[PDB]
Amino acid sequence: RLLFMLVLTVAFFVAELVSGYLGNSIALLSDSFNMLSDLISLCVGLSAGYIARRPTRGFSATYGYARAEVVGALSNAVFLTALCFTIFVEAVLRLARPERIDDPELVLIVGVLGLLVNVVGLLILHVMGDALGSVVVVITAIIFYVLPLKSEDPCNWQCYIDPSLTVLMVIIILSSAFPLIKETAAILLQMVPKGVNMEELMSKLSAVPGISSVHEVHIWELVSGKIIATLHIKYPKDRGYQDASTKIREIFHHAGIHNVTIQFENVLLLCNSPCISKGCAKQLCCPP
């Protein structure tokens, strides 16, 4: 399924890239860049599926390459942002010095076929983000198709209709992609996942019976679905820690965190094992 979509997207990205420069239409170039980003996303999803089956641990990636989806998503979003910045500059350059579409027919045909390939995805807002760019290409083509302009006549309204719609499409694509950048960065910055409410989680954690303190509660998301929590507990050492460990595990299970590595430091409110020597303080995370 996805391989056929990938080959179609690659072929038509190349086709639109060749047509836009040859046809002198920024909207076509914008759609070509958008389909290049779409094929990059498809390749990222294929790689994610491949790595998901037969997980590959080892001495290089102890967690496996599960973060590949997130890293590829961030990289693709930044790539699309840079391509959108380039397209915005070119529109602005061609907004002050208007340029004519040399091949309205070819631009129209490539836009129609790109719109068909863009709707095949739903025939099996980013999805709107690509479909609408294709329809902008078409729109410009008809404006240059019906009521055309002779090859030896200056710029008219028909000329500034392509750069304006291209700027609007760039705005739409950037608005759809910036939240993706924010979410991927939050995942990659080891920020607490959106679903997890660490405030009440820490309250419940401090309410467990026989727990005197709680520190170094590191919660971060590996991938969409796997949340990893590293936590340090202090136990009285004449009572024990088994019941407390079970209760803490149940709490983290209720919150959706199944990866817990509770270190039950002995009992006075600081970490009992910062490092081997006092000189490790600058390197320890969250210095005391």
Binding interface with Mn ion (CB under 5 A): 31, 114, 118, 130, 133-134
Binding residue for a copy of itself, selected from 3, 53, 154, 277, defined by CB under 8 A? 277
39 is an interface residue for a copy of itself by CB under 8 A:
no
Question: What residue is closest to Mn ion based on CB?
Answer: 134
Q: Which is nearer to a copy of itself, 209 or 288 (CB)?
A: 288
Contact region with a copy of itself (CB under 8 A), list: 7-15, 130-138, 140-148, 242-250:
242-250
Describe the crossing of helices 26-52 and 2-23 by its angle, rounded to 10 degrees.
160
Would you tell me the crossing angle of helices 157-188 and 68-96 to the nearest 10 degrees?
160
* CB environment 180-219: b (16+ within 10 A), e (fewer): bbebbebbeeeebbeebeeeebeebbeebeebeebeeeeb
Binding mask 147-166 for a copy of itself (x = CB under 8 A): --------------------
The CA distance from 17 to 1, in Å, is: 24
The one among 1, 123, 276, 278 contacting a copy of itself by CB under 8 A: 276
Whose tokens are 């997130």? That residue is: 70
Enumerate the H helices of 126-190 as residue ranges. 126-145, 157-188
Residues 164 to 193 in contact with a copy of itself, rule: CB under 8 A: 181, 185, 188-192
Selected from 100, 204, 218, 239, the binder of a copy of itself by CB under 8 A is 218
Residues 71-130 that bind a copy of itself (CB under 8 A): 71, 74-75, 78-79, 81-83, 85-86, 89, 93, 96-97
- Number of chain residues interacting with a copy of itself (CB under 8 A): 80
Rg (C-alpha) for the chain, rounded Å, is 27
Q: Is 219 in the site for a copy of itself (CB under 8 A)?
A: yes
**Which residues does the chain break after (C to N > 2.5 Å)?**
124, 267
* Residue 91 to residue 65: CA distance in whole angstroms: 39
